[PDB]
Write a protein that binds this DNA or RNA. Structure first.
Ligand SMILES: [K+]
Ligand SMILES: [K+]
Ligand SMILES: [K+]
Ligand SMILES: [K+]
Ligand SMILES: [Mg+2]
Ligand SMILES: [Mg+2]
Ligand SMILES: [Mg+2]
Ligand SMILES: [Mg+2]
Ligand SMILES: [Mg+2]
Ligand SMILES: [Mg+2]
Ligand SMILES: [Mg+2]
Ligand SMILES: [Mg+2]
Ligand SMILES: [Mg+2]
Ligand SMILES: [Mg+2]
Ligand SMILES: [Mg+2]
Ligand SMILES: [Mg+2]
Ligand SMILES: [Mg+2]
Ligand SMILES: [Mg+2]
Ligand SMILES: [Mg+2]
Ligand SMILES: [Mg+2]
Ligand SMILES: [Mg+2]
Ligand SMILES: [Mg+2]
Ligand SMILES: [Mg+2]
Ligand SMILES: [Mg+2]
Ligand SMILES: [Mg+2]
Ligand code: NA
Ligand code: NA
Lengths: 27, 89
RNA sequence: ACCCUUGGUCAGGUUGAAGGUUAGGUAACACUAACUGGAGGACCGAAUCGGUAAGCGUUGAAAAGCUUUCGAAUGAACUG
RNA sequence: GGCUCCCAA
RNA sequence: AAACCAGGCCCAGGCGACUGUUUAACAAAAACACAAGGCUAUGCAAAAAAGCAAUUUGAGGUAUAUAGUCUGACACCUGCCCGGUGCUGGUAAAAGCCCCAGUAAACGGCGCUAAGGUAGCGAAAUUCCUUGUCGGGUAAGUUCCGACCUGCACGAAUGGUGUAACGAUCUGGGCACUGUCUC
RNA sequence: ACUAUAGCUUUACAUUGUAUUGGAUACUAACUCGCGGCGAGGACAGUGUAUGGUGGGUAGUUU
RNA sequence: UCCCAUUAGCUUGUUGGUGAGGUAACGGCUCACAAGGCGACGAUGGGUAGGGGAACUGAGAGGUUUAUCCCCCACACUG
RNA sequence: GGUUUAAAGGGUGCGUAGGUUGUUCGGUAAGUCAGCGGUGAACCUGAGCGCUCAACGUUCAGCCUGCCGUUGAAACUGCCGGGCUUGAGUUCAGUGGCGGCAGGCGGAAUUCGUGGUGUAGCGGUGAAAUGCAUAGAUAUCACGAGGAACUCCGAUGCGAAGGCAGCUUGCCAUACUGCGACUGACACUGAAGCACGAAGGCGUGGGUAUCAAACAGGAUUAGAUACCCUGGUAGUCCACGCAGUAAACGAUGAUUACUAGGAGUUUGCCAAGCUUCCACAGCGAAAGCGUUAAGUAAUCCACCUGGGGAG
RNA sequence: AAUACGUGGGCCUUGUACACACCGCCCGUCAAGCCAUGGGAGUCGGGGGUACCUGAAGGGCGCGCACUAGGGUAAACCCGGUGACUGGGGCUAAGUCGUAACAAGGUAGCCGUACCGGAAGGUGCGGCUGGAAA
């Protein structure tokens, strides 16, 4: 219950989802 | 499951010695099979009754465990009861 | 050219959809394997319809053809 | 000839 | 396989899903059609089409129907603009017009403005310069394939980008084979 | 592009009448439609004359 | 008597029988009916390694390696 | 050695293999126990002897504490046969529920259209503007149409979990308590596997009122791709089919037995069966848990082994 | 002389990712410098497998026939390398743009999912307290 622990995971999820949304529609 | 005391008594008289023997493995297996068939008939109309499903599955599990007990105790009785009920499928 | 009514024609071979039966399987349907079945603007290919490519012909045998080659060939087929 | 299957009936 | 008879095959691109249709007599195709999608019109003497009319088609069908029009299997999708032009609403003895509002899978546009091109593609059936540059293939490649992006002058139903199967289509490279050639 | 025009559309007169309360409502008998007289509408609609819009659908021409 | 299931099915002399041949010797070892055999108690495949006693190490359990020493196996440029 | 919060309980069940098995009688001898026998260089351990000592060399006593064979024992586990009723299940009765599926019915509110009255604004904000309005809004009355959600009760209760709330009916399922009934260990857990599984999302067809991603406009700001305001499309609703995720949480897996007090509370008769808060022993690093344990113990499953890279 | 007295410091409680103590810590993109590693038209190797065709010696079988090492061919698999171009990640400094989180961090935070933005992020729907205030 610090908060930074969840902030790091939130950052990683943001980056991964941005990568996937950029890669969609391109083949 | 159109199940009432009269039907239960008829089943217990048919399977197992005396009509007061409600606890015999044969009587329990017969009762389980009867309500399994009736619940199947209910489900084919109420296809979305997921609570009546898994209640059907728990009944099937109970019947299987009683049959396994009959295997462990007296095999001839198990052959007789499955022949008289047409269970194996 | 298109339509309407009434008729006719399409050698032979191949593939193997739906469906069905039999075994297993399920609470019951589903689902797996074998046998069967014989669908399709399906396949190969005569008749037939068309006209790809090349050669020939160009006061031609013919005011549009011939030979070889090639497309379709149960269909939106061809034909009286 | 009938039979089977099919729908475009 | 005994003669006659009797598929050449493989790798990789563009276009069009496919079977069909077409310029009788120089073009068979990437053109037309297509199954399918959208929009619009039409309540039934329907709208619509022929006819001076009668009458007929639509159809003896009835909104899961009929007609007009664009797109063209399928997959992922289909951005912004209603300013202009269309369309829809609120004189003789009222319409209109105005004004306001709406409509882009309507025509059209995407440089002071109505909005100043989203995704995806890109020297492309589109690129003038131009045989652009780099990589591959060849001894050597103005064609071909893969990339790059200052796109003269791509771009989302006059559809965008892909796509298995199909093609007497266009285009590049191999093997087989040979009088196409050295001759 | 100029000028016409088929078609479509607006209004007036005719077809076309009655009553109430004019500007609307109501009526039935003109007229229209349906079923085999009855039903549904109704002085509207449709049609004729005139008139204003619209009209590359069609025509004659100019450039 | 080592790891990998990001290796789940493997097997046709393969499992058994009859007979024959062959071998120092039994045997599908080889050759002329039946369909069996092995498999989550890990078959098959892939990777890695010679194996033990020693030795070292730790209170012990255990762990590391087999340099010298001893035992067994494999090999002698490659088949 | 651990798993509430440091890494660590699977979203929840059912269930295959496997693991574990109430009480009692009698066998058997697989596990277990005991006796006897065989087998198991050098090095390593006490005692010597020789290296002038020592390393070292060597001899002898003490290790064989593994494997194999053969004789006995029967307490426990296993296997076989029989018995019991406490566990478990079936029956009967009582009571209870927002438990599931399906069909019908209802009122308040909101939106749109039509008509009547009426005219200078309504709406919105910290303040405004966009917006709607004399081609007649807001407001008010009536007619008509359609979709969605169920105020008060209402914080408790039910369900394996996700979840479940207008009324009513039909068809199901199930919990709890007792029985003077029945069977007689028939049990627990459970790798695979199967089923169910909020919201959002996808396909086909209906429906489309409110709200509202994207988007458009107006503001606030140095800018505002936001917070605020006005519009607005998917979606939100229904049927069928996919998908399989969550702070799917009690961040606490399931069974069984045992171990203090207080304060409330639901249900059928003091007492179960629940559902909530302080709090002994004990546990814990502490915060804290404490009969609904995170205490005392047994069985089985899941998971962890410094952080990032990296789900 | 005039004039009204009502609107930055201390105590208690609470939260904290601050302890040089909010003139605090701190994320993310773009730009810069080193390191490791993905995708890619193609292209170059290494040994093994399957099938076919040839095929030594030495036995066997009836001056020839099987058996076979080795050779050629094709494939397909596995293991490696390189490649125009094109993507993440780690580490070091700090150039640039902001302020997302930590206090109710100035719009409570976080989980899942969807759409959208130069970036931290924003918004919708459901959930949680690991939130104040009430
Ligand atoms: K003929
Ligand atoms: K080209
Ligand atoms: K026991
Ligand atoms: K929840
Ligand atoms: Mg984000
Ligand atoms: Mg054909
Ligand atoms: Mg012919
Ligand atoms: Mg043919
Ligand atoms: Mg074509
Ligand atoms: Mg063709
Ligand atoms: Mg021609
Ligand atoms: Mg021609
Ligand atoms: Mg077209
Ligand atoms: Mg096209
Ligand atoms: Mg050339
Ligand atoms: Mg190119
Ligand atoms: Mg267009
Ligand atoms: Mg003209
Ligand atoms: Mg003239
Ligand atoms: Mg943790
Ligand atoms: Mg849980
Ligand atoms: Mg978890
Ligand atoms: Mg902030
Ligand atoms: Mg904040
Ligand atoms: Mg937004
Ligand atoms: Na050739
Ligand atoms: Na939907």
């Amino acid at each position: 219950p610090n908060g930074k622990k969840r902030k790091r995971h939130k950052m990683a999820t943001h980056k991964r989802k941005k990568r996937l949304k950029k890669n969609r529609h391109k083949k | 499951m159109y199940l009432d005391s009269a039907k239960k008594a008829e089943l217990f008289e048919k399977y197992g010695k005396s009509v007061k023997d409600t606890g015999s493995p044969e009587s329990q297996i017969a009762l389980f099979t009867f309500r399994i068939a009736h619940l199947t008939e209910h489900l084919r109309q109420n296809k979305k009754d997921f609570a009546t499903e898994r209640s059907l599955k728990m009944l099937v599990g109970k019947r299987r465990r009683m049959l396994d007990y009959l295997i462990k105790v007296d095999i001839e009785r198990y052959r007789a009861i499955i022949k008289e009920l047409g269970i194996r499928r």
